[PDB]
Design a protein around this nucleic acid. Sequence first.
DNA 1: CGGCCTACG
DNA 2: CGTAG
DNA 3: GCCG
Length: 326
Amino acid sequence: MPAYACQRPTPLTHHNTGLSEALEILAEAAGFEGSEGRLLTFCRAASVLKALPSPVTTLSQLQGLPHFGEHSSRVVQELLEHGVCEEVERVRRSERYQTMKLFTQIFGVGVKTADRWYREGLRTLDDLREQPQKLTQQQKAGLQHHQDLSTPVLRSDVDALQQVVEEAVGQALPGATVTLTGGFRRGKLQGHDVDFLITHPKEGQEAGLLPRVMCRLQDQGLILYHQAFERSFCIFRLPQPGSWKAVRVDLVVAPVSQFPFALLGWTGSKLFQRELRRFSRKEKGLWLNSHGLFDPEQKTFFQAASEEDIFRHLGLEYLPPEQRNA
DNA sequence: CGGCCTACG
DNA sequence: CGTAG
DNA sequence: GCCG
Ligand SMILES: [Mn+2]
Ligand SMILES: [Mn+2]
Ligand SMILES: [Mn+2]
Ligand SMILES: [Mn+2]
Ligand SMILES: [Mn+2]
Ligand SMILES: [Mn+2]
Ligand code: NA
């Protein structure tokens, strides 16, 4: 088992679901306390289990696995022997965990804001609604739409949404294309939002595109909320039988020269991409982001025509999106 | 021990 | 500060 | 919390 998640296939469904979910609770809780290092170790340990070919049945099967030390091994041991880990359950029921989870779920609220509200004594959404002058416009939108935004987006919803985005994109710039990214591109059947990547085959034609797209979607009455720019974090009105629901949609524009890097970055998973950027820098001495791959010694950017090119540049076996579910 | 991804709005 | 994978 |  290699130490970096980008070095091994990780399928969407696997054989250690219960174990990985428990470690991800501890990862999430570490994030709420500002310990990004502990969050990373628990996320990485969970991801190792997702990549295994069969269920872990005995503690002995953890020896030699990367990111399993005393703490993560004790969690698994308690789950194997008792079906529950007391630490995990204590986190689950804790007021701190439940409230930080509730608050950070709000669009416009991060860990730092949620923690401040927690220290001020706030605990519920209605607490926040009874003091609305303290909220940003973004947070007000996130709170008004919170119920709809807590409802999973179905892959069945995504097709209809892509065609309306394509219509606006085609008026904004004929020939421009829309690609579904994020978790749906990795094969998820549900998600918390829809992610789209927009480009145009003629380099430079994409300049100034996203404002033109947003104006057109807004004129169609489809935009419930949005803030030159190249990323837009929106709330869209999506049809429903006899009504509609609010859905989070992210739109990103990239020049076609950067498209493989943007496709790779926006297809995720989040942990996969953090691990891939870490691997690039620490093992290969190259700097990766969603715009390109930089050699800081020769002062040059790698040209990529495909995701396959990027894996080759980095000396990694190619993984299709459905094996990037770290 | 230091490091932990790397951007844009 | 928020947001993205 | 774990790697290297
Ligand atoms: Mn170990
Ligand atoms: Mn026991
Ligand atoms: Mn998504
Ligand atoms: Mn998104
Ligand atoms: Mn850019
Ligand atoms: Mn996210
Ligand atoms: Na949030």
